């Protein structure tokens, strides 16, 4: 759900969404990582479970839409930022 902005979710949302006790979420996530559908990690001093990898899933038209939004939003930045290079050096690289 969250676009990897703060994906180091704490135990509580896991215990609520899966509605399992707090002392079992570790054993559940270690099983999921043992399977290999995710490549997160585990902290205990804060009991935050960091997320790194998610298996690629199926999506649909609207996901294609926002995806095209990211694609354009990044491509335009790439091109313009190269325009900054050429602008900064016209007769310098020959």
């Amino acid at each position: 759900t969250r676009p990897a902005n703060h994906r180091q979710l704490t135990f509580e949302e896991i215990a609520k969404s899966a509605k399992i006790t707090v002392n079992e979420v570790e054993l559940l996530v270690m099983k999921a990582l043992s399977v290999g559908l995710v490549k997160g990690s585990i902290d205990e001093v804060d009991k935050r479970v960091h997320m790194t990898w998610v298996q690629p899933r199926v999506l649909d038209l609207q996901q294609i839409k926002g995806m095209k939004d990211r694609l354009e939003f990044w491509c335009t930045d790439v091109k313009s930022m190269e325009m900054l290079v050429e602008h900064q050096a016209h007769d310098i690289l020959t």
């Binding site: 930022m81 900054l84 290079v85 900064q88 050096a89 310098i92």
Partner: peptide, 11 residues
């Protein structure tokens, strides 16, 4: 960006 501009001025 601007620092890269500084280097581009350097070379």
């Amino acid at each position: 960006t601007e620092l890269a501009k500084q280097v581009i001025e350097y070379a």
